Amino acid sequence: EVEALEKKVEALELKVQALEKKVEALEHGWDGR
Amino acid sequence: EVEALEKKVEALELKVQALEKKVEALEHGWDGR
Amino acid sequence: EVEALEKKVEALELKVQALEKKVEALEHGWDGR
């Protein structure tokens, strides 16, 4: 159970990081995004 | 404890999915968004 | 293990909340964002 929750949490960390990069690019207009 | 953390994690999965849909719509201009 | 996962999950909750605020501001044009 705990090891599987570790997996889900790390998967969420990656998804959140990807969202952060995309949202920062939209906010700041990076490379015309 | 573990069952409650499962709940928090699934709640985060849904919030992240909703954010992904919204960010993809902004990036791609879906339906004029 | 469990206490550390609680920490990671709450950190994700804060990151997701910040993303939600930023995405809602982009969607709605709050304050010219």
SS (H, E, C) chain C: CHHHHHHHHHHHHHHHHHHHHHHHHHHHCHHHC
Tokens 């949490």 correspond to A9
Yes or no: say if B26 and B33 are a contact pair by the CB < 8 Å rule.
yes
CA distances from A13 to B30, B32, C14 (A): 26, 30, 12
Which residues of chain B have a CB within 8 Å of the CB of A1?
2, 6
Task: State this model's resolution in angstroms.
Answer: 1.7
Out of B1, B16, B26, name the one closest to residue C27 (CB): B26
State how far residue A27 is from chain C, nearest Cα, in angstroms.
7
State how far residue C12 is from chain A, nearest Cα, in angstroms.
7
Which structural technique was applied? X-ray
Shortest CA distance from C32: residue in chain A: A27
